[PDB]
From Swiss-Prot:
One of its GO terms (molecular function) is translation initiation factor activity. The lineage of its organism: Archaea, Methanobacteriati, Methanobacteriota, Methanomada group, Methanococci. The keyword Protein biosynthesis applies. One of its GO terms (biological process) is regulation of translation. Keywords: Protein biosynthesis, Translation regulation. Transmembrane segments: none annotated. The chain holds residues 25 to 103 of 103 of the full protein. Belongs to the SUI1 family. It comes from Methanocaldococcus jannaschii (strain ATCC 43067 / DSM 2661 / JAL-1 / JCM 10045 / NBRC 100440). This is Protein translation factor SUI1 homolog.
Length: 79
């Protein structure tokens, strides 16, 4: 059971980020995923530990792209 969580966060003194977590890092390369997602959202981003952080609110965009890429619709939750 892979469980993908997509949500928005704003750290203290920060700007709104979109966070994506729950991928199996031994099978999925987050660096390449992030690069692909950054093109979809046209924003900056990085792999932060075992998560991807994107600048701005792109929850729906990301979720839809992940489905396009073959990830289960039912494995993804937007919060």
């Amino acid at each position: 059971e892979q469980k993908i969580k997509i949500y928005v966060t704003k750290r203290r003194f920060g700007k709104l980020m979109t966070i994506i977590e729950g991928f199996d890092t031994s099978v999925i390369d987050l660096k390449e995923l992030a690069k692909k997602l950054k093109d979809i959202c046209a924003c900056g981003g990085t792999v932060k530990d075992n998560t991807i952080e994107l600048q701005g609110d792109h929850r729906k965009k990301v979720a839809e792209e992940l489905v396009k890429m073959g990830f289960s619709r039912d494995s993804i939750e937007i919060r």
